[PDB]
Each structure stands twice: as structure tokens, then as C-alpha cells.
């Protein structure tokens, strides 16, 4: 009972994480210099992994 | 030949502007007569469909396979101060007496002074870093943006 | 000065109707351009010199500002979700753990009688569940 | 000089003297920002012979197009390369003795759609401010019958008949 | 019917994921700088700003719809997932 419901709670938190990863990726792209392009790739993979497992 | 292309461009762009006009009118009359029960999804949907469809369609019919619209210049032939019912029937329920005021009202390319002050501020911001950091930022942005679209187009498979 | 009873959402209507006026200006000018009478077209070859490198710098600063606003609305919605999740369906957990419930249509009802327990009493105990966190 | 389209040029003392050639004389008193000082037409006006000095002195000339007698005289500017070789530079139509440069077909549509996107942008950014969300509540803005009434209703109809209303 | 409701839930989920992905990809594509031809820098920039803001709003709306889907699925599970009703009754 707590199992499937806690799965639903986790998917709530991961929808929040998906929106925050979208926002962080365009945050890094809006920078005048964005040196951590590897971190941009990491945030992009994080975003797509979040959407996919949701 | 090119005049037929200009006539096609004028008809197609008048079509797109007519769709945007009907979309704006439907949205404003919906806001008036439908004021109650109006959720934020409803107005986001209307804003998105209106601006997305009609701005993108105007841009794509403005920037492919078209004659240069700087080349055509607008000039009037006559100015006759009389109530022309054929003009009233042409321009749709608008455009009173064809006189000394309407063409000096319409051929106006000075914008509002707010966006003119905005343009002054853009030229002020243009006085900053240019031609090395500018080219560097353009190239890096295009590279990383192509990289992300490549990532998403790969993962979509 | 009075309008069909719209005292909120008036300024949005002002901006939209100003857009409607200039769009009627566009329809007007291209229609009177489209007929040969009252307005005409002449093909002129003229050229302009851009005084500064406008597409590079203008596209740069405008796209950084646009991406700034987009990230602002996105991250504002994100933190709204964070504060938004940090109660109805927990009470539905407890209520279903003690009582017998079901859903018909959009309505959520429950049985109060002992007809599950064996009574043939000709009276149904249908109580409604009403979100108000929860009420019956 | 920055935007020639947004300027207006008049002379009020030369309004009641307005005839066909006097439109181009009106155009050539002095100090019009539109009309050039280095035009050939000034050199035409310097010595003599305004009939053929438009043509023998090759360059930018200012050719009147269409004549309406009270207010409308269309002055067009062209470059010549030879006699009977006419190439358009710019257009200048007069209205009540007021010259306006004729705008291009592109720039008018661009200026109007600029005002379009600006107005809808302000409207949308206002509308985005009002909407407030909660998952439990949803969206919002920042601004019975006991079923024995069939018998009571039939009794009401019998009351309507047995006692009618009287205005 | 129950089948119809489950199908509708599947449709909503597919639509929400598709919308988030499409809006993000379209924002990234507009983010490309291109050379201008007959677009008048200022107008092109305002149109692009409006598009980005509207797409971000659409992404947030899709996230809210996904929250609504999760809530509806939770309600369905609490009301008619027969095993857990049986373990609750027995306990």
C-alpha cells in the first residue's frame, strides 16, 4: 500500500526535478560565458533521464 | 512574372494576417462575453495557439522564396474627399472619407517611443564587447545548441 | 467610460485591442495596396548601409535576454512546485482503510449499512465524500 | 538624418503659391533635408535652360509623377545614365504642401508586427502574473430536495388552480 | 468503462511527455542564431522572446497536468486496487 503510493510520490518529486533540470539547462545556456559545457551535457542527460523514467 | 509572385505573396500574407485578426477578435470577445470560469490553461492555450501559429506562419511566409519587400514602395494615386462606398465595402466596416489624413496615418514607420528607447538601450548595450567575444559566443552557442539537439534527436530513437 | 463589466482583465484587453487596431491597419494597407486604385506599387532598387554589425550583436543580446526570461519563468514554476508539494488522498487512504467506498461518475460514495454484513434492511447508506481536508 | 522616414518638411509661406512647376520650386527653396543640395537640379537652377539640363547633366534628377491640382503632386527621384534611361532612387509625395517619403512595403509590415508582438508580450506577461497554482486547490487568480416534493408540487398545482394569481 | 478510463490516462501521459519534449526542443532550436533576411532584427527578436516565454509556460502547464495525472492515478489505486483493500480489511 505504501509501495505504489510512494512510487507516485517519487514521480511527483521527479516531475519537479524535470522542470528544474529544464530550467537549469537554459540557465546555463543564457550565461555570457558557459565554461562547464560538460556540465551542460550532464544536465541535459539528467533532464532526458528524468523525463524518460517518469 | 515577378508581379504574379508579388500578388501571390500579398494574397497569402493577407490570409495570414486575416487569421491572426480573427484569432485576436475571438480571444477578445471570449474574454468579454466568457469572463467567468476562465482558467489559466484556457488563456495559455489561446495565447500559445494564437502567437505560435500566426507569428511562425507569418515568419515562414515572410522568409522563404519571396520577393524582397524593401523593393516595393507604397504610393497613392488620388485623394478625393468623398464618401466612397466601394472603399467602405473593400476595407471591411472601416476607413471613412478618403482624405488628407488617412494615408499620413497609415504610412507611419516611426514606432512607439518606448521601443525606440528600447532600441537606444540596445545600441547602448551594443557599445560593449564585440567582434571577438561576440563571434566566440555565437560559435559556442551554435555548437552547444546543435549538440543538445543532436542528443535529444538521438535519444528520441 | 465603461465596459461590459470586466474590471479585472482590462489592461490585457487594452494591449490586445491595440494589436487588433494595428492588425486592422495591416489588413487595410495591404488591401488598398492590393487594388490598383487609391494606392500603387513601384519597384525601386535601393540599398542601405548598416552602420554597426547589427545581426551578430543584436541577435546576441536579444537571445540572451529571451533565454533569461524563459529560464526565469521555468525556474519560478519549479520552485513553486517545490513549495507546493512541501493531503486529500492520505485521508482517502485512512477513510478507505476504515470504510467501504466506491466511485460513480465523478462522485465518490460510500456504504454505511450492514448489507455487506448481512442485513436485508431496505435502506441504502450512501454517504458522499466532499473535499472541504475531507468531509462526509 | 538618422531616419529619413520619420521627418516632415514644410514651408507655410510657399503654400498659397502652388502650381505644377511651383511644386518643384517649393521643393527647391533651400534647407529641405530630403531634397539634396548637391542635386543636378540646383545646377539647372543656377544659370539657365531648365528644359534640357535635366538630361545633359547626367545624375540624380527629381521627376514629378502624378498631378492632382489642390494637394497631391508625386515627386519621384531617379538617377539617369543617359537620355531615356530612368532608374528609381526614392519617392516623395506631397499632401497640402507637406512632403512625405514613401515607405517601402517591407518596413510598414515589420513596424506593425513589431507593435503587435510588443503589445501581446505586455498582455501575456501581465496575464502570467495573476495565475496562482496549488496541486490541491488547482488554479485560481490573484484577484436539497427530499423526494416527497412530487406530492407537494402536485399540491402546488392544485393550489394554483383552486386559487389563481391576480395581478 | 474502466478500460476507457485507463486508455484516457495513457493518452494524457503520452500527450504530456510529448509536449514537454517538443517545447524544450523548439526553444533550443529557436535559440539558434541565424543570419537575417527580410525579418528586421527588432521584430525577429521580439517574436523569438514571445515564443520562448510561451513555450516555457507550456512546459510548466504540462508539468501541472502530469501532477493532475499522478493525483488521478493515486485516487484510482486507493479506490479500486483489490489486493490492498483485502490486506487492509484483514489487518
Residue from the list B20, B69, B78 with its beta carbon closest to the beta carbon of D109 = B69
Residues near E40 by beta carbon (within 8 Å), at least 6 away in sequence: D106, D107, D110, D114
D98 burial via Cβ count (<10 Å: 0-12, 13-18, 19+)? middle
Does C68 contact chain B (CB < 8 Å)?
Answer: no
Q: Do C24 and B74 touch (CB under 8 A)?
A: no
Nearest CA to CA, how far is C56 from chain B (Å)?
A: 7
Q: Where are the beta strands (DSSP E) in chain B?
A: 72-75
- Could you tell me the three cell numbers for B81? 474627399
Question: What nine digits make up the cell of A50?
Answer: 528524468
Q: Is D83 on the interface with C (CB under 8 A)?
A: no
Residue D21, SS3 per DSSP: helix
Q: How close B126 comes to chain E (CA, Å)?
A: 13
* CB-side neighbour CA atoms (13 Å) of D148: 1
Interface B–E counts its CB contacts (< 8 A) at 55
Q: Which residue of C has its CA nearest to B96?
A: C28
Closest Cα to residue C87, out of E63, E71, A11, E69?
E71
- Do the chains contact at E70 and A1, CB–CB below 8 Å? no
SS3 labels along chain C: CCCCCCCCCCHHHHHHHHHHHHHHHHHHHHHHHHCCCCCEEEECCCCCCCCCCHHHHHHHHHHHHHHHHHHHHHHHHHHHHHHHHCCHHHHHHHHHHHCEEEEECCEEEEECCCCCCCCCCCCCCEEECEECCEEC
d(CA E4, nearest CA chain C) in Å: 13
- CA nearest E42 in B: which residue? B119
Q: Give φ, ψ of D79 to 5 degrees.
A: -100, 135
Question: How many H-runs (helices) and E-runs (strands) does chain A carry?
Answer: 2, 0
Resolution in A: 4.4
Q: Which of D141, C9, C17, D138 is nearest to B34 (CA)?
A: C9
Q: Please give, rounded to a whole number of angstroms, the shortest distance from the CA of E8 to a CA of chain B.
A: 19
- Give the C-alpha separation, C32 to C38, whole Å: 7
- Give how far D133 is from chain E: nearest CA, Å: 9
Q: In Å, how far is B60's CA from the nearest CA of chain C?
A: 18
Check CB contact of E66 with chain A, cutoff 8 Å.
Answer: yes
CB pairs under 8 A between D and E: 33
Chain E segment 35-74 residues within 8 A of B by beta carbon are 37-39, 42, 44, 47, 50-51, 54-55, 57-58, 61
**Backbone angles phi and psi of E34, in degrees to 5:** -130, 160
Q: Do C16 and D90 touch (CB under 8 A)?
A: no
Interface check for E54 against chain A (CB to CB < 8 A): the answer is no
Beta carbons of B144 and A48 less than 8 Å apart:
no
Residues in chain E with CB shorter than 8 Å from the CB of C58 are 41-42, 45
d(CA D117, CA B51) in angstroms, rounded, equals 8
Instruction: Give one word for A27, left, alpha or beta, with left for phi > 0 and alpha for psi -120 to 50.
Output: alpha
* Terminal Cα distance for chain A, rounded: 20
Selection from E37, A16, D56 nearest residue C78 by Cα: A16
CA pair distance A24, C50, nearest whole angstrom: 36
Q: How far, in Å, are D14, D28, D29, D64 from residue D22 at the CA level?
A: 9, 9, 10, 11
Q: Which residue of B has its CA nearest to A25?
A: B148
Counting as contact any 3 or more CB pairs under 8 A, the partners of D are B, C, E
Asked if the Cβ–Cβ distance from C44 to D128 is below 8 Å, we say no
Task: Give the span between the Cα atoms of B125 and C61, in whole angstroms.
Answer: 8
Q: Do C55 and E35 lie within an 8 Å CB cutoff?
A: yes
Give the B window 54-83 contacts with D, CB below 8 Å: 55, 58, 68-79
The 10 Å CB-count burial string (b at 16+, else e) for B124-156 is ebbeeeeeeebeebbeebeebbeebeebbeeee
- Which residue of chain E comes nearest to A49, CA vs CA? E21
Q: How was this structure determined?
A: cryo-EM
Subunits next to C (3 or more Cβ pairs <8 Å) are A, B, D, E
- Facing E46 at nearest CB: one of D117, D128, D133: D117
Amino acid at each position: 500500500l505504501a509501495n505504489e503510493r510512494l512510487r507516485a510520490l517519487e514521480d511527483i518529486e521527479r516531475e519537479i526535478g524535470a522542470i528544474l533540470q529544464n530550467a537549469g539547462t537554459v540557465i546555463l545556456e543564457l550565461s555570457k560565458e558557459k565554461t562547464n559545457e560538460r556540465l551542460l551535457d550532464r544536465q541535459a542527460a539528467a533532464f532526458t533521464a528524468s523525463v524518460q523514467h517518469v | 512574372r515577378e508581379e504574379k509572385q508579388l500578388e501571390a505573396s500579398l494574397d497569402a500574407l493577407l490570409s495570414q494576417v486575416a487569421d491572426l485578426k480573427n484569432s485576436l477578435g475571438s480571444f477578445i470577445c471570449k474574454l468579454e462575453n466568457e469572463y467567468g470560469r476562465l482558467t489559466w490553461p484556457s488563456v495559455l492555450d489561446s495565447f500559445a495557439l494564437l502567437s505560435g501559429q500566426l507569428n511562425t506562419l507569418n515568419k515562414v511566409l515572410k522568409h522563404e522564396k519571396t520577393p524582397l519587400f524593401r523593393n516595393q514602395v507604397i504610393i497613392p494615386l488620388v485623394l478625393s474627399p468623398d464618401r466612397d462606398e466601394d472603399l467602405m465595402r473593400q476595407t471591411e466596416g472601416r476607413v471613412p472619407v478618403f482624405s488628407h489624413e488617412v494615408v499620413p496615418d497609415h504610412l507611419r514607420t516611426k514606432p512607439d517611443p518606448e521601443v525606440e528607447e528600447q532600441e537606444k538601450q540596445l545600441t547602448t548595450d551594443a557599445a560593449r564587447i564585440g567582434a571577438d567575444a561576440a563571434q566566440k559566443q555565437i560559435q559556442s552557442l551554435n555548437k552547444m545548441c546543435s549538440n543538445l539537439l543532436e542528443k535529444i534527436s538521438k535519444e528520441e530513437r | 467610460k465603461f465596459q461590459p463589466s470586466l474590471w479585472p482583465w482590462d489592461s490585457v484587453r487594452n494591449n490586445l485591442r491595440s494589436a487588433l487596431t494595428e492588425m486592422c491597419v495591416l489588413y487595410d494597407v495591404l488591401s488598398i495596396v492590393r487594388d490598383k486604385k487609391f494606392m500603387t506599387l513601384d519597384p525601386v532598387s535601393q540599398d542601405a548601409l548598416p552602420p554597426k554589425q547589427n545581426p551578430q550583436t543584436l541577435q546576441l543580446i536579444s537571445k540572451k535576454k529571451s533565454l533569461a526570461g524563459a529560464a526565469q519563468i521555468l525556474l519560478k514554476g519549479a520552485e513553486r512546485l517545490t513549495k507546493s508539494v512541501t493531503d486529500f488522498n492520505s485521508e482517502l487512504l485512512r477513510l478507505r482503510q476504515h470504510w467501504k467506498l466506491r466511485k460513480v461518475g465523478d462522485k465518490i460514495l460510500g456504504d454505511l449499512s450492514y448489507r455487506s454484513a448481512g442485513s436485508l434492511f431496505p435502506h441504502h447508506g450512501t454517504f458522499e465524500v466532499i473535499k472541504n481536508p475531507l468531509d462526509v | 538624418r538618422d531616419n529619413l522616414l520619420g521627418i516632415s518638411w514644410v514651408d507655410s509661406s510657399w503654400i498659397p503659391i502652388l502650381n505644377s512647376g511651383s511644386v518643384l520650386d517649393y521643393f527647391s527653396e533651400r534647407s529641405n533635408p530630403f531634397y539634396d543640395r548637391t542635386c543636378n537640379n540646383e545646377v539647372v537652377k543656377m544659370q539657365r535652360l531648365t528644359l534640357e539640363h535635366l538630361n545633359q547633366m547626367v545624375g540624380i534628377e527629381y521627376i514629378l509623377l502624378h498631378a492632382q491640382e489642390p494637394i497631391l503632386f508625386i515627386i519621384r527621384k531617379q538617377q539617369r545614365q543617359s537620355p531615356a534611361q530612368v532608374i528609381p532612387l526614392a519617392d516623395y509625395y506631397i499632401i497640402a504642401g507637406v512632403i512625405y517619403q514613401a515607405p517601402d512595403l517591407g518596413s510598414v509590415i515589420n513596424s506593425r508586427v513589431l507593435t503587435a508582438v510588443h503589445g501581446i508580450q505586455s498582455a501575456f506577461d501581465e496575464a502570467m502574473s495573476y495565475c496562482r497554482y496549488h496541486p490541491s486547490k488547482g488554479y485560481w487568480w490573484h484577484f436539497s430536495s427530499i423526494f416527497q416534493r412530487q406530492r407537494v408540487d402536485a399540491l402546488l398545482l392544485d393550489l394554483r388552480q383552486k386559487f389563481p394569481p391576480k395581478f | 468503462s474502466k478500460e476507457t478510463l485507463l486508455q484516457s490516462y495513457n493518452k494524457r501521459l503520452k500527450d504530456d511527455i510529448k509536449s514537454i519534449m517538443d517545447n524544450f526542443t523548439e526553444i533550443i532550436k529557436t535559440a539558434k542564431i541565424e543570419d537575417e533576411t527580410q525579418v528586421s532584427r527588432a521584430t525577429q527578436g521580439e517574436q523569438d522572446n514571445y515564443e520562448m516565454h510561451v513555450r516555457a509556460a507550456n512546459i510548466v502547464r504540462a508539468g501541472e497536468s502530469l501532477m493532475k495525472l499522478v493525483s488521478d492515478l493515486k485516487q484510482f489505486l486507493i479506490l479500486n486496487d483489490f489486493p490492498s483493500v483485502n490486506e487492509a480489511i484483514d489487518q
